Design a protein around this ligand. Sequence first.
Ligand SMILES: [Ca+2]
Ligand SMILES: [Ca+2]
Ligand SMILES: [Zn+2]
Lengths: 155, 77, 77, 75
Amino acid sequence: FFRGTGYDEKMVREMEGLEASGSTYICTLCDSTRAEASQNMVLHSITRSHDENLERYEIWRKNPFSESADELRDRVKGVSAKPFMETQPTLDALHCDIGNATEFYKIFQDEIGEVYQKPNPSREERRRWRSTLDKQLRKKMKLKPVMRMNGNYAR
Amino acid sequence: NTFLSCSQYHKMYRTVKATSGRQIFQPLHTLRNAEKELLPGFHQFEWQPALKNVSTSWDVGIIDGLSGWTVSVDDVP
Amino acid sequence: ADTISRRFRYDVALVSALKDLEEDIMEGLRERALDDSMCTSGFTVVVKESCDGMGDVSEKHGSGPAVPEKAVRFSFT
Amino acid sequence: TNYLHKTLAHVPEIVERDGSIGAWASEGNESGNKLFRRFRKMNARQSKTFELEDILKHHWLYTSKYLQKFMEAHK
DNA sequence: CACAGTGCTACAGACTGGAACAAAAACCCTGCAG
DNA sequence: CTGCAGGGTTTTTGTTCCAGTCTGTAGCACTGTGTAAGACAGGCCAGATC
DNA sequence: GATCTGGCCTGTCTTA
Ligand SMILES: [Ca+2]
Ligand SMILES: [Ca+2]
Ligand SMILES: [Zn+2]
């Protein structure tokens, strides 16, 4: 029994026919769109699978109902390329931790200043907030910033 | 001379001793004892005449290069 | 064909990785106290596979042909 | 972000289905990449032709269990 | 709740030494047994 | 003759502890393998048309 | 000359 689980999201998306990586259709396991999973967050059921994506690429290429580009893209929930490798519907752990830590690093960078009072901050203000946050995170926790965030910084 | 890390060498030592030994290599703490002869600060010497503004103690090992900076905040860091 | 690549065939690398773990499957049959000779036809092996790229692998002068720098490494466990 | 949607919506489902998550993580591949660099300076012949062949062989010899049993030295 | 290291320092267990003891391994040796 | 119980016998095998002397692992703080373009929404202008 | 719309361009967002 073979279980393909070691790929990150970039490779799973490009080897299953999805669109990488900031598409409207966010989930590799579900069909919810970017704005739809903003209202509703915690209720979703796993649907996507290999054979269903093969059949959906077939629908997109044959196009039996003759829809425009956008409607047809909506019918197949964003399957525009034939998948060739099969990938088990699971979640990578490491890059999940890295993505969540970069999200919280942006939240802290936002909270140093006041973004819910002043909704349009300037670029220099962003730089100053990141600089003072890294100064504080150097004085305590003994961390030095990184350009791209490896996993040790997340833990 | 073969770029063997200390911990890799201890791994090799345990391996060659436990299985069919009769160990051949020496333990780590006796290698570290044959070290203090090679590094500087072991042999005696004498400068004639005495060196200018240089201490005459002959046992200084690794010294920190800062050389006594008055770390206090108000000066150069 | 701008690609230099090498690979073991899947079946051959699998039977060698399974024939290597024979010590542990025999020891598990012993500890589990299950009969070694009997009920030997229904085994099941669950295998995790993984594929990944790697940036800035420096190129060599060499003869030919020209090759990109990024490398891809397919492995299994 | 996508990972927030996966970590807030589909975690109970996959932990119940697979039985575990993070034991199948990609960590087990990325770590190996480290090897690929040491095995391209120390142990790989310095030629474009044979380089992949010798790296593949030395990696398969490092990863086997049969030599790790010997290297355990029984405590 | 990655994981195999990364070296130096610290202190844990393995040693002797006589005193003396017990338990045991196994010969041999006597009693009580047909 | 044999059988088994229980006597002694030597010789393991280890028995208590304090000076040590030596060996092997634990504690310390931290490493490195995670390394690129693509999607989308809004502003606008230039060339086509009536 | 007034009108318009397709597509060009630019900034942010997302996983690497
Ligand atoms: Ca990648
Ligand atoms: Ca990758
Ligand atoms: Zn989803």
